[PDB]
Amino acid sequence: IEAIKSKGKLVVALNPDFAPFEYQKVVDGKNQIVGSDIELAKAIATELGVELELSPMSFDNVLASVQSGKADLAISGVSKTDERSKVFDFSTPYYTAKNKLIVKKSDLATYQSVNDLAQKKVGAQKGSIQETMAKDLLQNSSLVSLPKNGNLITDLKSGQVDAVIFEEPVAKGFVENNPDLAIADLNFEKQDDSYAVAMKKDSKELKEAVDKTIQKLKESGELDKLIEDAFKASIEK
Ligand SMILES: NC(=[NH2+])NCCC[C@H](N)C(=O)O
Numbered sequence: 157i158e159a160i161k162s163k164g165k166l167v168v169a170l171n172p173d174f175a176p177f178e179y180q181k182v183v184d185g186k187n188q189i190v191g192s193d194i195e196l197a198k199a200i201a202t203e204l205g206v207e208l209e210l211s212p213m214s215f216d217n218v219l220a221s222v223q224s225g226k227a228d229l230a231i232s233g234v235s236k237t238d239e240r241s242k243v244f245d246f247s248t249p250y251y252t253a254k255n256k257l258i259v260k261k262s263d264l265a266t267y268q269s270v271n272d273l274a275q276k277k278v279g280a281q282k283g284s285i286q287e288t289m290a291k292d293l294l295q296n297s298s299l300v301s302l303p304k305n306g307n308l309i310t311d312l313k314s315g316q317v318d319a320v321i322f323e324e325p326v327a328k329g330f331v332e333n334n335p336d337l338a339i340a341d342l343n344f345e346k347q348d349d350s351y352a353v354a355m356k357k358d359s360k361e362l363k364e365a366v367d368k369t370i371q372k373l374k375e376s377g378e379l380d381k382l383i384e385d386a387f388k389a390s391i392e393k
Pocket residue numbers: 170171172173174178215232233234235236281283284285286323
């Protein structure tokens with residue numbers, strides 16, 4: 157936190173292809189990075205009395221950038237995991253999600269359970285816990301792991317993959333803008349998937365500032381409003 161205050165800016169790593177949390181929106185003819193995680197980042201920077209600097213990158217590189225010191229925080233829809241918790245400090249959680257499949261709409265009732273994915277092609281984002289889930293459970297499937305979420309959506313449209321695994325709000329956001337797609341019936345037989353801010357190990361005072369901010373936004377209902385606003389603003393008109 158002292159290094160951050162002294163340098164006058166907070167550098168946040170994120171991958172802006174993940175509405176409602178972070179995404180690109182055309183504003184006045186130019187793409188701008190927006191979303192509920194950007195509003196969370198702004199609140200943290202305000203708490204610390206510093207400027208906010210975004211560092212957009214592929215999701216696969218977000219955590220590594222925090223680990224090496226190239227960014228101060230990852231605020232990028234990052235799930236806590238035991239493996240990650242060994243290497244990173246995490247904030248208190250700020251969102252909890254279920255995993256879903258997005259499919260072509262004619263396939264929404266084909267996929268009920270994981271067994272229905274046998275002999276099918278399933279995509280997930282490279283570096284995500286969804287990619288890990290697919291690798292660990294779907295031995296009878298062909299797995300595609302792509303750096304960019306938009307490219308997973310393109311592959312699902314071209315019928316190059318049969319399904320893509322995404323957390324529910326993100327899946328819903330893509331369906332809003334793609335009426336050729338739908339959320340499948342499938343559920344996974346559920347540990348917690350909770351989003352948190354990642355930071356370097358042993359950053360106690362930075363964690364305090366982040367957690368004070370999350371606590372405030374939760375108790376006021378503001379965080380809920382931010383996610384809803386961002387979801388609405390991600391729908392293309
Ligand atoms: N901005 C993004 N692309 N976020 C992807 C997050 C996926 C998942 N919650 C994870 O932490 O692995």
